[PDB]
Each structure stands twice: as C-alpha cells, then as structure tokens.
Design a protein around this motif. Structure first.
Motif, PDB file in Angstrom:
ATOM      1  N   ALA A  53      12.293  77.027  25.657  1.00  0.00           N
ATOM      2  CA  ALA A  53      11.220  77.115  24.674  1.00  0.00           C
ATOM      3  C   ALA A  53      11.357  78.314  23.723  1.00  0.00           C
TER       4      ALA A  53
ATOM      5  N   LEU B  38       3.777  78.717  32.153  1.00  0.00           N
ATOM      6  CA  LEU B  38       4.619  79.319  33.178  1.00  0.00           C
ATOM      7  C   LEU B  38       4.643  80.853  33.061  1.00  0.00           C
ATOM      8  N   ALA B  39       4.664  81.377  31.829  1.00  0.00           N
ATOM      9  CA  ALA B  39       4.648  82.832  31.649  1.00  0.00           C
ATOM     10  C   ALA B  39       3.345  83.464  32.152  1.00  0.00           C
ATOM     11  N   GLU B  40       2.227  82.897  31.720  1.00  0.00           N
ATOM     12  CA  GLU B  40       0.944  83.437  32.153  1.00  0.00           C
ATOM     13  C   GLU B  40       0.818  83.403  33.678  1.00  0.00           C
ATOM     14  N   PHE B  41       1.320  82.328  34.293  1.00  0.00           N
ATOM     15  CA  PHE B  41       1.261  82.233  35.740  1.00  0.00           C
ATOM     16  C   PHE B  41       2.051  83.359  36.391  1.00  0.00           C
ATOM     17  N   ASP B  42       3.191  83.732  35.801  1.00  0.00           N
ATOM     18  CA  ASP B  42       3.899  84.905  36.316  1.00  0.00           C
ATOM     19  C   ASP B  42       2.937  86.080  36.478  1.00  0.00           C
TER      20      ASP B  42
ATOM     21  N   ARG C 235       7.852  70.720  35.969  1.00  0.00           N
ATOM     22  CA  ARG C 235       8.999  69.882  35.648  1.00  0.00           C
ATOM     23  C   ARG C 235       8.619  68.412  35.779  1.00  0.00           C
TER      24      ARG C 235
ATOM     25  N   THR D 225       8.559  82.356  37.119  1.00  0.00           N
ATOM     26  CA  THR D 225       8.242  80.948  37.289  1.00  0.00           C
ATOM     27  C   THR D 225       8.846  80.194  36.113  1.00  0.00           C
TER      28      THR D 225
ATOM     29  N   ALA E  25       6.393  75.720  39.250  1.00  0.00           N
ATOM     30  CA  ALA E  25       7.514  75.290  38.429  1.00  0.00           C
ATOM     31  C   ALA E  25       7.868  73.833  38.716  1.00  0.00           C
TER      32      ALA E  25
ATOM     33  N   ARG F  75      11.024  78.267  30.076  1.00  0.00           N
ATOM     34  CA  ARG F  75      10.622  79.287  29.122  1.00  0.00           C
ATOM     35  C   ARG F  75      11.777  79.679  28.215  1.00  0.00           C
TER      36      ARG F  75
ATOM     37  N   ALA G 244       5.806  76.129  28.554  1.00  0.00           N
ATOM     38  CA  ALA G 244       6.470  77.417  28.782  1.00  0.00           C
ATOM     39  C   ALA G 244       5.469  78.569  28.743  1.00  0.00           C
ATOM     40  N   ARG G 245       4.452  78.441  27.894  1.00  0.00           N
ATOM     41  CA  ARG G 245       3.409  79.453  27.866  1.00  0.00           C
ATOM     42  C   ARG G 245       2.716  79.535  29.214  1.00  0.00           C
TER      43      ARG G 245
ATOM     44  N   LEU H 262       4.646  83.785  23.809  1.00  0.00           N
ATOM     45  CA  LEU H 262       5.627  83.351  24.795  1.00  0.00           C
ATOM     46  C   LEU H 262       6.452  84.515  25.309  1.00  0.00           C
TER      47      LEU H 262
ATOM     48  N   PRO I  46       4.868  88.096  28.135  1.00  0.00           N
ATOM     49  CA  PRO I  46       4.971  88.399  29.577  1.00  0.00           C
ATOM     50  C   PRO I  46       6.297  89.037  29.950  1.00  0.00           C
TER      51      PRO I  46
ATOM     52  N   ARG J  64       4.981  80.387  42.956  1.00  0.00           N
ATOM     53  CA  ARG J  64       5.687  80.264  41.690  1.00  0.00           C
ATOM     54  C   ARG J  64       6.616  79.044  41.701  1.00  0.00           C
TER      55      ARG J  64
END
Lengths: 207, 198
Positions: B12, A93-97, A188, B4, A184, B9, A90-91, B146, B149, A180
């Motif tokens: 989590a 995915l956030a940074e990729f945003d 998954r 994304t 994702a 997220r 999940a981290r 987390l 962002p 994005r």
C-alpha cells in the motif's frame, strides 16, 4: 453478543474481546499458510472471516472505518471499491500495531493461555498465567475480572457451537504476536473474499 | 521490531518499514564502495547487515524465507551453503523489485524526502513531498497516515541510538532507485558475512 465498550476493555488488557468477534462469526484465523488464505478456505469460510474482520475494524477503528465507508460509497467501479478497501486495510493494520502494544503494556503479562472446556452441559474456562503473574495474585484477580464478561459471552458462543458434540478443549495462546498474526490473517482473507465477489455476477456488495 | 501485516502495508506504500528494519539493527546500507563491503566494514557491521537482511526477507516474504532456511540447512558443505544463499538472494531481489513497483504505484510520487530531527528530548519528522503531491493534500494526508505508525517506531529507535547527543538531523531520500540500491547493499554484505561464518 454485546460489543458496547469493546475498545476500552481492549485497551485496558481485555485482548480477548478480539476472539469473541471471530467466534461470534465462526471465522478462520490460525491458518497453515496465512499467506494464501485463498488456498485453503471455501467461499463460505472466506466470507465468514470477512464478516468478522469488518465487525472488528468497525469496533477498533470507527472513525477510520467511517472514512473508508465514505470513500467506498463514492467509488463506482468494483475495481475502484476493491482498491479503496486495500488502501484502508493497510491503514487498519498500522493502527492495530499501536493498539496491541498499548493493551499488553497494561496487562503486565506477555502471554497467557486460555482453555475453554466444553461438554454435554455447561463449560468452563481456565486462564494460565506466567510465573510473573503467578507471583502476583492481585493482578491475576484483575485479569480474571477484566475478561470475565467477554469470557462468559465466549463460553456461551462456543457451547452453542458444540451442541450435542463430544467433550472438546480449546487452547488459545494469547500474546501480542499471536493477536497481530490473527488480525493479519483475517485481513488477508477479507480482501480475498472481496476480490472473489468483484470478479463475479456478485459484483455488487455493501457487505 | 514487530508488525501486523507488514507486507500489505508495504504494498500500500509503507516503504518506510524497510528503513525501520535497518536502523533497528544498526545495519549499514549507504556504502562508499558497495561492491567490496568486506573492504569497508569489520566483522561486526557485516553481521548486523546479515541480521537485518534476514529480518527483511522473513517480514516481506515469509514463505520464501522458510524455503531458503530449509534448503540452507540441508546443504552441508559451506560452499553449498553459500550457493543456496546466492540462489534465494536472487529470488528475493526479484520479488522485492516487484514489491517496490506496486508500493510506489500506490504512492504516486516518484521520490520523497524524510527528515528525522533528534534533540536533547523528543524528536520529530517531516516528510518533504514532491510538488504534485504538495498540491494534493488528500494524497499528502494519506501517505502521512499510513507511514505515521512506522515513523513513530523509527523515531523511537533513533532516539534511543542518539541518546545524550547534540542536535542531529537524519535525511532519507526515498525512491524506488534508493530502496533497490539499499537492499542490494544488504544482500552483498549479508553474503560476505555468510562466507565468513560458514
């Protein structure tokens, strides 16, 4: 393939670096239900996506990947290891945003189309620009220059994949949204591959 | 407001995604009589609620959203349109209930406070932790990493909303209780808007 300086190319607008990793692994990312990757991919395809995903997170988030690798070493239950993985997923995915938006702001073009042409001999590529970049050949040249080294690596990879096969044309619609969505999807699939390994007689892994 | 992996997220622990959708539509969700939303909001806010609500369902439950869109289109009488809505609304409220439970299982903190500070210039946020997690700097850093962002996007949205305004401080009380109540508020307002529209 070569990944020296991938992040900087990516930030500057070379979003296509992403595609290379996926193809250098033959990973699936444009799925019918990219909400049940488990539903449609064999153990091999899921593992392949997992491989591409792990290479990509090492490349775009090396400190984060380093951190997760550490915690993952520390854990001992396979249950503890999958939970560690989901936590850092999940981290990622956030940074990729953040990174996607940065890259596309530098491109100054919201979408491109990339066509790879494969035949008996050498292939070709074709970057279709939108009217804003049709009207600005200077940028159009800059984009072409930026992608060229990675685009060439990509053409080589695809051509070795289609040896002795009929003429095939791949079209990639490249936008912030699609990048994005692909990431994702591989994420998954990566978790799905991991869950399968842990429930089994392959409960050991270092990937 | 585009993500994304929002679902992953959120599971989590990134429950703040919910708040983001709300503010980025300027939807109303902490209502006085959240049993007659028609009584407390004009046609426009109810519409903002319906918009934000549908964003939420698509973001966390895309497959649910598609199923319902198809069914709602197939219905032809407006009564049946309201009915398809009520059905898939109850399915969504259940799915979200489960989503919240796992989110907070990963948070390990039964409630949190979020403060967004806006000034003439750039704002800041401060997450007030409960005491067990105040005493747990690893948990603290992880939650902050987390959430960060999403928090940055939300601060940007709020800053554009409170442009040229005196120093304002928004506080969010974040718990499973509060999240469940907010989304239920959205659901009832969204149905009211729908009843209007069809």
């Amino acid at each position: 393939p070569d990944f020296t300086g991938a992040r900087e190319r990516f930030l500057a607008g070379d979003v296509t670096i992403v595609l290379l990793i996926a193809e250098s692994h033959d990973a699936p990312y444009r799925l019918a239900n990219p909400e049940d990757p488990e539903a449609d991919l064999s153990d091999e395809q899921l593992e392949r996506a997992l491989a591409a995903y792990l290479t990509l997170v090492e490349t775009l988030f090396p400190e984060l990947y380093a951190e997760m690798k550490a915690a993952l070493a520390a854990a001992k239950t396979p249950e503890e290891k999958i939970a560690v993985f989901r936590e850092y997923n999940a981290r990622f995915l956030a940074e990729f945003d953040a990174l996607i938006d940065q890259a596309f702001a530098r491109l100054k073009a919201d979408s491109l189309t990339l066509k790879i042409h494969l035949s008996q001999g050498k292939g070709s590529y074709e970057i279709i620009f939108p009217p804003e970049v049709q009207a600005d050949p200077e940028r159009a040249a800059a984009i072409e220059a930026l992608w060229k080294p990675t685009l060439d690596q990509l053409l080589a990879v695809l051509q070795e994949k289609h040896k002795g096969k009929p003429a095939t044309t791949v079209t990639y619609e490249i936008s912030a949204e699609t990048l994005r969505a692909a990431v994702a999807a591989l994420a998954r699939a990566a978790e799905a591959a991991l869950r399968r390994k842990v429930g089994s007689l392959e409960s050991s892994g270092l990937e």
